[PDB]
Amino acid sequence: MKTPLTEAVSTADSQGRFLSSTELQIAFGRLRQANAGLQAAKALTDNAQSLVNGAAQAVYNKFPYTTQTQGNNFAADQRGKDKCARDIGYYLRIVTYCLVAGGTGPLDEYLIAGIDEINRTFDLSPSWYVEALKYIKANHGLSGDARDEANSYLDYAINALS
Amino acid sequence: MKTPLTEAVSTADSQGRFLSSTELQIAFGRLRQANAGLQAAKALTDNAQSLVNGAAQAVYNKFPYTTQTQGNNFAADQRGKDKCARDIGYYLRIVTYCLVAGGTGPLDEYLIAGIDEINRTFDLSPSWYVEALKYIKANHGLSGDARDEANSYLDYAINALS
Amino acid sequence: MKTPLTEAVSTADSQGRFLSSTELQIAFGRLRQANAGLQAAKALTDNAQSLVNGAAQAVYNKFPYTTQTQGNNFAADQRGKDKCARDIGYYLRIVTYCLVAGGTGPLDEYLIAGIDEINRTFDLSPSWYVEALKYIKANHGLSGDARDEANSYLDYAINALS
Amino acid sequence: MFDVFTRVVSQADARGEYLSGSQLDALSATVAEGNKRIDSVNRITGNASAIVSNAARALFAEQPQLIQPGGNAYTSRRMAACLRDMEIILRYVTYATFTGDASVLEDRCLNGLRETYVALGVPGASVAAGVQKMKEAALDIVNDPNGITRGDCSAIVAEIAGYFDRAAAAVA
Amino acid sequence: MFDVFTRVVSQADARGEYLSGSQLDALSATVAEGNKRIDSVNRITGNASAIVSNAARALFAEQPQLIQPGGNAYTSRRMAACLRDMEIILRYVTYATFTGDASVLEDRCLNGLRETYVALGVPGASVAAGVQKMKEAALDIVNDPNGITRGDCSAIVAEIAGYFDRAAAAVA
Amino acid sequence: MFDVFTRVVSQADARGEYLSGSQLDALSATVAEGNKRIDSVNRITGNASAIVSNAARALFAEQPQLIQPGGNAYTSRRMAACLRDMEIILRYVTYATFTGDASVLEDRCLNGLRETYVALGVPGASVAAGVQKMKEAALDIVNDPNGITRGDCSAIVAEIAGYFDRAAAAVA
Numbered sequence A, B, C: 001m002k003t004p005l006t007e008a009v010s011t012a013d014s015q016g017r018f019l020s021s022t023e024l025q026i027a028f029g030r031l032r033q034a035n036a037g038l039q040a041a042k043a044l045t046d047n048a049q050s051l052v053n054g055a056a057q058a059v060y061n062k063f064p065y066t067t068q069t070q071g072n073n074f075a076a077d078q079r080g081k082d083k084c085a086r087d088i089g090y091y092l093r094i095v096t097y098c099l100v101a102g103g104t105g106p107l108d109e110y111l112i113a114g115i116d117e118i119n120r121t122f123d124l125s126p127s128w129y130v131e132a133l134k135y136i137k138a139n140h141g142l143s144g145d146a147r148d149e150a151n152s153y154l155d156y157a158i159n160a161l162s
Numbered sequence D, E, F: 001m002f003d004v005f006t007r008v009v010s011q012a013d014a015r016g017e018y019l020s021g022s023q024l025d026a027l028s029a030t031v032a033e034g035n036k037r038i039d040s041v042n043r044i045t046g047n048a049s050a051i052v053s054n055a056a057r058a059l060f061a062e063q064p065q066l067i068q069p070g071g072n073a074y075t076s077r078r079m080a081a082c083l084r085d086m087e088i089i090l091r092y093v094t095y096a097t098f099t100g101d102a103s104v105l106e107d108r109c110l111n112g113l114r115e116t117y118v119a120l121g122v123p124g125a126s127v128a129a130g131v132q133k134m135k136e137a138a139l140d141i142v143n144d145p146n147g148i149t150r151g152d153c154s155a156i157v158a159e160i161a162g163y164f165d166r167a168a169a170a171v172a
């Protein structure tokens, strides 16, 4: 998983050299933003259920057919609604991991890599998830740096889905 | 051994893809010519002895010295004549394999690859064999497709020797 | 270790071929110079002590501080003087190996490769050794080919240090 | 690789013999079944995606421990990798059906696959179950009576089942 | 590789759980120690050469059989190679200190090092002694009270000692 | 690789000693035999083809099972490969004779050859017999009294026989 720290090490290693001042400065920048990230992670965590359920309904509201047509890739039944909820729960949880890691690493390795093949194979629409993400961004109630941190990763995921 | 079927698979595999209509059509073409090939193989097989002996004499007739000078690479003695007969027998047998495989595969892997080194090391003349092959082409008594099939492989071998 | 003989073999091998007349001639040249080299090696060997001690003092004489300042890389004490003597002894011994091998091989593999890292790590000055080598060149008392042989390797080492 | 024809040739050559009349007749009969063989390759190929996804669904339904957090197939990259393996195996099964010989499937796919999975920590027995699922899905499509000239495809269907079973055993 | 943060993340993910309040507080406390960590990396990095040479000196003083004719470290190329190994290990120890996780040191340096030395005939137990020598030299420089704001660096110093000790054990 | 001179050097260095008077005299005597050594390399090199073919003939005459259908050396590509091995080994034997040391033959040719043949299914004991055949052919050519200044070539002939015997044992 890429984090500002592992990228600096990878760079120095790929060059067979010890870390430089620039790399040490990179660490300082990471450290200065860390707490805002940990605080945002805590906030989102304490509201996981509310945010997940609230986002699930949001998707069904903009895509009602997903609850009306029959199909494994739709949430017309209870089972599909659990699948959907679970999926939304994964997005949220992994976003808090990014906030903790100070980088997109968790999203890239746990959910983004291969997401196109997953959606194409099980016939899931990336627009459903894009919708759930937008909901989160408008209901986490964060503010200041904690807000800017959370949204930076929420937007990253969105762009990855469109 | 290359056959129309293995080449189609090799092509698709080298491209990491499933076989295409063109490749399926290739199989159809191979199947349509198969029987003429199997029938030609049967004919040549039932006349192996006659064709082999007849070709051996043909070579000695055009290259009498091979039966008059002394030498391991010549058939001046009984032993050399067996070697020679055996060699001619290999050419014929392997040509029936090509007719069965619908391709030059058997000739390329069993006799052609390395034939120059063999002839250069044991001092054998490729013209001797070219002669034996021509004999076969004019004495197998085939006709129609079975004839065109047999001769396509007999000419292939000839060109490989010149 | 490179010698005129191993280089000829390496060349032929890198080309997948048997040795050529030129390579055989190379061997003749090597053989013609061999004895002068063995004789020079014997002479230097019988005077190792005199040459080593004489060179050590020479270095101290041109670089007196090496015996006056304190430091692991200096010979201000007994220990450092043994280190220094030992080092000079290595240069001499390995030069006789070159004379025996008819090439720079021994010097390249035993002392030259990595000498810059060694001197930089233990803070040794290549000029100290260059001095000891010059001393040897002016006190071995050789002459003729034996002299030209010895000096060719002594100069080689010098250039490697500057 | 060998195809149905060269397999016979190699066995004959290694003995220094011409193909016997009965062997030539056997190959001739294989040529007669040609259309059924090519239809099988066309049908599995044209339905590859559906075969892999439907088999994947069934597999994860019976073995939910593979997709829950910590499971070998949990996370997008591993799920995609697992899906990719399914497709790879299916692809090579079509090559074997096309040539009429298992060599291509063995040499270029199954050889060393068990050892590779053991090192990665992939549950081979679960892969085998996935392969079995693909067989069921693929063979129903192959033997579907609709839109195709009527006939007995038992032998070719059995042969294809054999390639799938060989794949499952190679990792189970 | 993992860094101190992603190590926790991976353990949480493999369980399908969010980081607990106490884990977030633990990471927060690590961030508070940040300056001490970066100072350690800067000080070892800036004194690398001196650390390797002084450790090399001590090593050869206690084990003279390594540098006499026939010794693994005899001749310029082997001595230089030995010096290079010392630096490599030190370099990777700084990477681990920088990230706060041993993974980079394990994966890219120590993994298979014992087997590599055994094949080359390098006395691993002597390498371990060299690593121990570098630890002593490096930690005195890290914990030098001069020219740096006063504080307790015990925990970071202990952690660094741990990376050195892991390196020594990997080849001893 | 080592040559006759550097072999002695390496043994002396690994001891930290100069070559003794008797060792220098031994090398000097080797230099005196120089012409005989170079003649041997020239004669085997100039007759390589004849040596390989005549040895190949003899080998197949005594072991006809190698060339009949199914035999390891049956078919053009395998026969050519077998002939090529013979030449490779001969080539490396000339390198060893040229340098006066077996190292080049061992390191670049024989090392791991037995294991390689076992994996391919090449009958090593038959290769060894082929090597022995090449020795006989090569040494008759080397020690032919015609067209060369008279002398005793016993020692060099023995040394060359030693390289051939080492080659045969490496795969038998």
Ligand SMILES: *[C@H](C)[C@H]1/C(=C/c2[nH]c(/C=C3N=C(/C=C4\NC(=O)C(CC)=C4C)C(C)=C\3CCC(=O)O)c(CCC(=O)O)c2C)NC(=O)[C@@H]1C
Binding pocket: A059, A060, A063, A066, A067, A072, A073, A074, A075, A076, A080, A081, A083, A084, A085, A087, A088, A090, A091, A110, A111, A118, A122, A124, A128, A129, A132, D057, D060, D067, D073, D074, D075, D076, D079
């Ligand atoms: C919700 C917004 C909508 C919805 C969802 C739905 N999803 C699935 C199935 C899968 N979802 C995933 C996604 C992930 N797996 C991961 O490991 C990760 C990273 C941690 C992600 C993002 C996967 C792999 C599957 C398939 C495997 C499985 O079943 O678990 C389904 C079921 C599809 C099926 O055919 O069985 C559904 C219904 N459906 C909706 O209608 C909502 C709008």
Ligand SMILES: *[C@H](C)[C@H]1/C(=C/c2[nH]c(/C=C3N=C(/C=C4\NC(=O)C(CC)=C4C)C(C)=C\3CCC(=O)O)c(CCC(=O)O)c2C)NC(=O)[C@@H]1C
Binding pocket: B059, B060, B063, B066, B067, B072, B073, B074, B075, B076, B080, B081, B083, B084, B085, B087, B088, B090, B091, B110, B111, B118, B122, B124, B128, B129, B132, F057, F060, F067, F073, F074, F075, F076, F079
């Ligand atoms: C016949 C037309 C003339 C003739 C032939 C002759 N051939 C040989 C020896 C060899 N021939 C081969 C050829 C093959 N071996 C194979 O495996 C295949 C593919 C299946 C082929 C085509 C080989 C390998 C040899 C040498 C090994 C052996 O003896 O089997 C000889 C003997 C040469 C010798 O020196 O012993 C002869 C005489 N000679 C003639 O005069 C005819 C005109």
Ligand SMILES: *[C@H](C)[C@H]1/C(=C/c2[nH]c(/C=C3N=C(/C=C4\NC(=O)C(CC)=C4C)C(C)=C\3CCC(=O)O)c(CCC(=O)O)c2C)NC(=O)[C@@H]1C
Binding pocket: C059, C060, C063, C066, C067, C072, C073, C074, C075, C076, C080, C081, C083, C084, C085, C087, C088, C090, C091, C110, C111, C118, C122, C124, C128, C129, C132, E057, E060, E067, E073, E074, E075, E076, E079
């Ligand atoms: C003498 C001219 C001056 C001098 C020398 C001095 N040298 C060292 C230490 C080392 N020298 C070497 C050199 C070699 N080692 C080899 O294996 C070879 C090839 C055979 C060579 C040329 C090495 C490796 C060392 C360091 C390891 C060791 O101690 O053996 C020292 C000691 C340095 C120290 O810090 O301990 C000294 C003093 N010093 C002088 O003042 C002379 C002018």
Ligand SMILES: *[C@H](C)[C@H]1/C(=C/c2[nH]c(/C=C3N=C(/C=C4\NC(=O)C(CC)=C4C)C(C)=C\3CCC(=O)O)c(CCC(=O)O)c2C)NC(=O)[C@@H]1C
Binding pocket: D066, D071, D072, D073, D078, D079, D081, D082, D083, D085, D086, D088, D089, D108, D109, D110, D113, D116, D120, D122, D123, D126, D127, D130
């Ligand atoms: C799916 C049903 C199951 C599953 C699969 C899974 N596989 C991998 C990784 C690899 N699979 C292969 C296999 C092949 N590669 C090939 O080129 C070929 C053709 C010759 C085959 C058969 C390889 C090489 C890998 C590793 C390299 C790579 O990832 O590309 C993984 C990933 C494991 C990981 O941690 O990275 C997974 C998850 N997993 C399951 O749970 C199912 C039972």
Ligand SMILES: *[C@H](C)[C@H]1/C(=C/c2[nH]c(/C=C3N=C(/C=C4\NC(=O)C(CC)=C4C)C(C)=C\3CCC(=O)O)c(CCC(=O)O)c2C)NC(=O)[C@@H]1C
Binding pocket: B021, B024, B025, D032, D033, D034, D035, D036, D038, D039, D040, D042, D142, D143, D144, D145, D148, D149, D150, D151, D152, D153
């Ligand atoms: C077995 C899986 C089922 C089955 C097969 C079956 N197929 C045929 C005949 C034909 N199949 C083809 C195939 C193709 N034509 C194409 O254009 C392409 C794309 C390149 C393919 C793959 C063809 C041309 C024929 C012959 C003409 C026709 O359509 O009838 C038969 C009949 C016999 C025979 O071999 O010719 C049979 C029995 N039939 C079944 O009931 C199984 C479910």
Ligand SMILES: *[C@H](C)[C@H]1/C(=C/c2[nH]c(/C=C3N=C(/C=C4\NC(=O)C(CC)=C4C)C(C)=C\3CCC(=O)O)c(CCC(=O)O)c2C)NC(=O)[C@@H]1C
Binding pocket: E066, E071, E072, E073, E078, E079, E081, E082, E083, E085, E086, E088, E089, E108, E109, E110, E113, E116, E120, E122, E123, E126, E127, E130
């Ligand atoms: C020094 C304290 C001791 C010593 C060392 C010595 N090492 C080698 C050779 C090698 N060391 C390595 C190790 C690594 N290479 C890497 O890239 C990494 C990072 C992943 C490590 C840890 C390797 C690969 C080699 C061999 C290849 C090479 O030389 O570069 C030698 C040389 C041995 C030889 O004969 O050539 C030596 C002498 N020797 C000692 O006596 C000390 C105890």
Ligand SMILES: *[C@H](C)[C@H]1/C(=C/c2[nH]c(/C=C3N=C(/C=C4\NC(=O)C(CC)=C4C)C(C)=C\3CCC(=O)O)c(CCC(=O)O)c2C)NC(=O)[C@@H]1C
Binding pocket: A021, A024, A025, E032, E033, E034, E035, E036, E038, E039, E040, E042, E142, E143, E144, E145, E148, E149, E150, E151, E152, E153
């Ligand atoms: C532990 C080894 C010793 C120790 C450390 C210590 N350091 C600080 C504070 C700071 N360290 C830095 C580091 C850098 N500044 C730079 O410009 C660079 C180069 C890129 C580095 C590495 C900084 C900026 C600070 C804060 C400002 C300052 O200099 O005071 C502290 C104090 C606390 C705190 O974390 O801030 C401590 C305790 N102190 C010791 O006594 C050990 C011997």
Ligand SMILES: *[C@H](C)[C@H]1/C(=C/c2[nH]c(/C=C3N=C(/C=C4\NC(=O)C(CC)=C4C)C(C)=C\3CCC(=O)O)c(CCC(=O)O)c2C)NC(=O)[C@@H]1C
Binding pocket: F066, F071, F072, F073, F078, F079, F081, F082, F083, F085, F086, F088, F089, F108, F109, F110, F113, F116, F120, F122, F123, F126, F127, F130
């Ligand atoms: C001949 C007397 C016997 C014989 C030989 C035979 N050898 C091979 C194949 C190989 N031989 C080698 C050996 C080397 N390759 C090298 O580069 C070197 C120098 C370091 C050596 C010693 C190798 C690598 C191969 C395989 C790769 C290749 O074919 O090039 C074969 C072919 C086996 C096959 O099935 O392909 C044969 C037949 N066979 C005999 O029966 C004789 C006793």
Ligand SMILES: *[C@H](C)[C@H]1/C(=C/c2[nH]c(/C=C3N=C(/C=C4\NC(=O)C(CC)=C4C)C(C)=C\3CCC(=O)O)c(CCC(=O)O)c2C)NC(=O)[C@@H]1C
Binding pocket: C021, C024, C025, F032, F033, F034, F035, F036, F038, F039, F040, F042, F142, F143, F144, F145, F148, F149, F150, F151, F152, F153
């Ligand atoms: C041992 C195999 C037999 C033998 C050898 C022998 N050779 C010589 C002498 C010479 N050999 C050469 C060699 C070459 N001259 C060349 O131009 C080339 C091509 C590059 C080669 C290989 C030379 C120049 C000589 C010396 C001059 C001469 O021809 O006499 C001797 C004599 C001694 C001595 O070493 O000089 C001997 C004994 N003699 C035998 O009877 C063995 C059968």
